[PDB]
């Protein structure tokens, strides 16, 4: 896309092959068991990618970013059938398109599915390094720490008082090991400022905490 | 590899362009903080993948097959500083080579880097359904459970008595989630033939369990 400094042409080969435009979020598109013969390039807007278990816990270990790919674990895996990784966080764009048509465009250039593979790639090693992390209950200061590690990513929101990331209690069932329920305390004393301030479901680290 | 029902050409084209001829097991290769610039085949033997978290266990995660490969994770990945994924599981025999070289064979067939994407990928579908699974502290009926498992897997070896599988309960600190210590208790009931029959660290399941 242009505006921005990316400066990728053959991407702009690639959306110029597919088809940019999603929804606001929550719109999940295969992780249900449905065949991911469709694929997703988020180009704008984030998701929420999530797994499923072997006790069939559905929970999202993962996320994209405005530039990254959806549906490659079901083109590129080599699922056919789910395999999980997708529900929208944002209201994105996606260059959403046919993976027939694409894996012929990603074979008509060597450096687009490497440049695909390497997303995934990523995200073993972001996998590799988080799996046993919140399965450790860590939750006494793993719930702000997440909260903190927004501030940190482009999902900080500058406002006149704090910069806020809205933050459902139900990504830190997720990210911490627990429900919204031990983090529920904690997530209910944030709307309280007695951890921060959550101004609904966004939550506004003031400054001091 | 001849003698066994392969098929595969553009292996033959691969292994005679690397280095086949591994050594029994203990050998790591790279999981410490290695620049993962070498690659290696598993060819004959299968190791045990390994990760690390954000405490440092560096746990063993998934593990291979007789044809698999390793260091992916360093070259295709895009680590390059080890990042995780190897400790020897058995006496193998890989074929290991540097991706500088390597590389360039991988790129004059789109097809050979392509099956080794799909490897990692099928990892990628390993640990996206058995990360919070050893995480539930499930210990009742999940340690035996892959027990059972190794009678399913090419390892079972049969003997005039039973057939087994050697695992020391270390591998099962890691699929369980504890420490061969509540697994401990079990494991040693094991060799009391109360559960199992472990003949060393051997493990048969003679039948009836």
């Not at 068991?33 to 469709?38: F, I, L, R, S």
């Not at 059938?81 to 046919?98: H, L």
């Not at 073993?124 to 799996?131: D, G």
Request: proline share 3%; with cysteine; glycine share 8%.
């Amino acid at each position: 896309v242009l505006g921005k400094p990316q400066t990728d042409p053959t991407l702009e080969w690639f959306l110029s092959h597919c088809h940019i435009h999603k929804y606001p979020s929550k719109s999940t598109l295969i992780h249900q068991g449905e065949k991911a013969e469709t694929l997703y390039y988020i180009v704008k807007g984030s998701v929420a990618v999530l797994i499923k278990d072997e006790e069939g816990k559905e929970m999202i270990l993962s996320y994209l970013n405005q530039g990254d790919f959806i549906g490659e674990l079901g083109l590129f895996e080599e699922g056919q059938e789910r395999s999980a990784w997708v529900r929208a966080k944002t209201a994105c764009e996606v260059a959403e398109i046919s993976y027939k048509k694409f894996r012929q465009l990603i074979q008509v250039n060597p450096d687009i599915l490497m440049r695909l593979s390497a997303q995934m790639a990523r995200r073993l090693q972001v996998t590799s390094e988080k799996v046993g992390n919140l399965a450790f209950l860590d939750v006494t200061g793993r719930i702000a720490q997440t909260l903190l590690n927004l501030a940190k990513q482009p999902d900080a929101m500058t406002h006149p008082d704090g910069m806020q990331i809205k933050i459902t209690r139900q990504e830190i069932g997720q990210i911490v090991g627990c429900s919204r329920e031990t983090v529920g305390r904690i997530l209910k004393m944030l709307e309280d400022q007695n951890l921060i301030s959550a101004h609904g479901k966004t939550i506004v680290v003031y400054g001091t905490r």
